[PDB]
Structure 1
Amino acid sequence: TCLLPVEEPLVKKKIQDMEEEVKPGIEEIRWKSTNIDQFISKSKSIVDQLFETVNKMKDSLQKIHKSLANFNVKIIERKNRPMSPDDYDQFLKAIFSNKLTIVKDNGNQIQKLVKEVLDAVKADKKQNSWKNYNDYVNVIVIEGISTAIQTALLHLNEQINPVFIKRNDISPLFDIRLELGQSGIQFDPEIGESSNQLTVRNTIRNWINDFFNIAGTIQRLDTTMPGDFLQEIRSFFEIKQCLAMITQNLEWIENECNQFRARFDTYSYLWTEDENPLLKGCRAKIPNLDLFDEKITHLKAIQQEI
């Protein structure tokens, strides 16, 4: 019950090799009452060899699956509290580089683990057992990276509603300024600029894409020429999908900010027209200057409203 958990026909061939053989002459050894311990020693030597194989297999299995938890714990502890407006964001870039450094350290570990399993399989037709092994190893690696970016994307998912248990703008978040440019509403961090990556500047979504690369760049087995970017692309959108709440919440705050922009446009202010044409229209009216003084009083009340 030790070779079936790994489900390896290689170690099944090994159990076929192993057997306690005890010869017909030994059926006539115990009736002597003298020193008769040779068959036990032989079968036991066999046993020992198998048990060192067992320990190697258990250690390889353990370390393989344990190296995965490090990715997830690192990415969690890292993306729990980013708090990265633009320059703390510039620095969180280097912090995520430390994340990728944990990833590359476990890649330096990828080398050592394929070596330890070189020892573990202990086969001559190594590659055939290499299939049965690295297949499963790679699928579990995919699962681990998936859960990693899961926790990250869900971290930043948990930032939308300021109404559920408390508010959400609890910490210093990215700051956005409101300007009157060329006689019109203008957000220097435009909703679209903090949104869709355009020529002037990139923001949250491109940050997500770059985090996606930082995560999915380990050296896979099976000739190692590619990377496992794509089992990620598959899995996230197979069940997990967190990018979806990302998109919909981003567009939600977008619509909220557009409504607020319309509200700003509602100041009842004119089209910022030249003062000369309105002056000339009132001139054509030929009113007393007191009407222009009431117009200026309205303008002063507009300044007071501002």
Structure 2
Amino acid sequence: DQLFETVNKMKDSLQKIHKSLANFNVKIIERKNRPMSPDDYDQFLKAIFSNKLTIVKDNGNQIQKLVKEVLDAVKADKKQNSWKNYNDYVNVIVIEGISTAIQTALLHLNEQINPVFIKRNDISPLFDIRLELGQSGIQFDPEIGESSNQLTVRNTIRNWINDFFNIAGTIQRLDTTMPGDFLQEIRSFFEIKQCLAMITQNLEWIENECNQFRARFDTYSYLWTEDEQISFNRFLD
């Protein structure tokens, strides 16, 4: 019974660790029906992101406590190598689970972010873009580009991608190091890189065709704004 109960506790702990990881990934992004605004999505998304981040941390705390229970059930010294090898294995499963959860959230964004899936569906538009005439050129409120300054769709999407990466802090490693990062391990995964790479390709595709659509207005309207009024005299002779 002592041997049996200890084995069940070890099996129960591993099973509990796996179940917690699956529930925590959820949906990374939720679409609230009709379009609002870029800043607005960050505003509406920020409330959802905080709740999702807190839930992931709560699941992580339970998994960390579950690991402590195994040592009590096993009654094996931490110094012994056998426990150390097992300790790394639990951490690896959590890492693998985090990669799958982050991958699902990124994949959900890809279906919304990629145009071909969107064209087939009746979902159509999600984000909202504002166009204001600019003397230097036609300028969008989003500005369609990486930019690296002020606010842009790529900068926001870039912030969105960081939130999945941010879930790394909640895990706080598995054992041996009190303070540990999880972004380096998740970034290393080949599967995570492919999903991230796919998202970047979709963003570039809309910008190209989008530039062509903006170019048609730019062929005559942009040229007009640039020319000075005193150009009327030149037209006469």
User: Structure 1: where are the runs of 5+ without partners?
Assistant: 1-47, 275-293
**C-alpha deviation, 1:153, in angstroms:** 0.9
Whether the 8 Å CA contact 2:26–2:105 is kept in 1: the answer is no
Q: Quick one: structure 1 residues 66 and 178, their matched pair in 2 at CA, closer, same or farther if it must change by over 3 Å? A: same
The 10-residue stretch of structure 1 (242-251 or 183-192) with the greater mean CA deviation from structure 2: 183-192
Whether the 8 Å CA contact 1:107–1:218 is kept in 2: the answer is yes
| SS, match of residue 271 in structure 1 | helix
Q: Quick one: structure 1 residues 202 and 300, their matched pair in 2 at CA, closer, same or farther if it must change by over 3 Å? A: farther
Whether the 8 Å CA contact 2:114–2:202 is kept in 1: the answer is no
The 10-residue stretch of structure 1 (137-146 or 49-58) with the greater mean CA deviation from structure 2: 49-58
- Pairwise mapping of residues 122-137 of structure 1 onto structure 2 (< 5 A)? 122-124=75-77, 127-137=80-90
TM-score, normalised with respect to structure 1 = 0.62
Whether the 8 Å CA contact 1:150–1:242 is kept in 2: the answer is yes
| SS, match of residue 267 in structure 1 | helix
Q: Quick one: structure 1 residues 300 and 134, their matched pair in 2 at CA, closer, same or farther if it must change by over 3 Å? A: farther
**C-alpha deviation, 1:180, in angstroms:** 1.3
The 10-residue stretch of structure 1 (144-153 or 215-224) with the greater mean CA deviation from structure 2: 215-224
User: Structure 2: where are the runs of 5+ without partners?
Assistant: none
Residues of 1 paired with 2:31 and 2:81: CA distance? Answer: 39
Higher relative contact order (CA 8 A, sep 6+): 2
Deviation track 1:200-238 (CA, whole Å, cap 9, x = no partner) reads 994211221233213553121234433342454444435
Whether the 8 Å CA contact 1:197–1:203 is kept in 2: the answer is no
Residues of 2 paired with 1:135 and 1:220: CA distance? Answer: 10
**C-alpha deviation, 1:120, in angstroms:** 2.6
Q: Quick one: structure 1 residues 194 and 155, their matched pair in 2 at CA, closer, same or farther if it must change by over 3 Å? A: farther
- Detail structure 1 runs of 4+ shifted over 6 Å in the superposition: 76-84, 194-201, 294-302
| SS, match of residue 139 in structure 2 | strand
RMSD of equivalent CA atoms: 4.6
Deviation track 1:177-213 (CA, whole Å, cap 9, x = no partner) reads 1121225311221012688777999421122123321
Whether the 8 Å CA contact 1:146–1:235 is kept in 2: the answer is no
| SS, match of residue 193 in structure 1 | coil
**C-alpha deviation, 1:267, in angstroms:** 2.7
Whether the 8 Å CA contact 1:74–1:102 is kept in 2: the answer is no
- Pairwise mapping of residues 1-306 of structure 1 onto structure 2 (< 5 A)? 48-73=1-26, 75=28, 85-124=38-77, 127-160=80-113, 162-164=115-117, 166-167=119-120, 170=123, 173-182=126-135, 184-192=137-145, 202-237=155-190, 241-267=194-220, 270-272=223-225
**C-alpha deviation, 1:164, in angstroms:** 5.0
The 10-residue stretch of structure 1 (192-201 or 61-70) with the greater mean CA deviation from structure 2: 192-201
**C-alpha deviation, 1:131, in angstroms:** 0.7
Q: Quick one: structure 1 residues 71 and 108, their matched pair in 2 at CA, closer, same or farther if it must change by over 3 Å? A: same
Residues of 2 paired with 1:300 and 1:151: CA distance? Answer: 62
Percent identity of the aligned residues?
A: 97
| SS, match of residue 242 in structure 1 | helix
Whether the 8 Å CA contact 1:149–1:215 is kept in 2: the answer is no
Whether the 8 Å CA contact 1:79–1:155 is kept in 2: the answer is no
**C-alpha deviation, 1:249, in angstroms:** 0.9
Deviation track 1:54-80 (CA, whole Å, cap 9, x = no partner) reads 222221222122222222346588999
Whether the 8 Å CA contact 1:194–1:203 is kept in 2: the answer is no
TM-score, normalised with respect to structure 2 = 0.78
Residues of 2 paired with 1:263 and 1:74: CA distance? Answer: 38
Q: Which has the larger radius of gyration?
A: 1
Whether the 8 Å CA contact 2:17–2:66 is kept in 1: the answer is yes
**C-alpha deviation, 1:52, in angstroms:** 1.7
Whether the 8 Å CA contact 2:22–2:101 is kept in 1: the answer is no
**C-alpha deviation, 1:108, in angstroms:** 2.1
Q: Quick one: structure 1 residues 103 and 183, their matched pair in 2 at CA, closer, same or farther if it must change by over 3 Å? A: closer
Whether the 8 Å CA contact 1:121–1:129 is kept in 2: the answer is no
Whether the 8 Å CA contact 1:180–1:186 is kept in 2: the answer is yes
| SS, match of residue 224 in structure 2 | coil
| SS, match of residue 196 in structure 1 | coil
Whether the 8 Å CA contact 1:80–1:152 is kept in 2: the answer is no
- Which protein has the bigger helix share? 2
Residues of 2 paired with 1:82 and 1:54: CA distance? Answer: 53
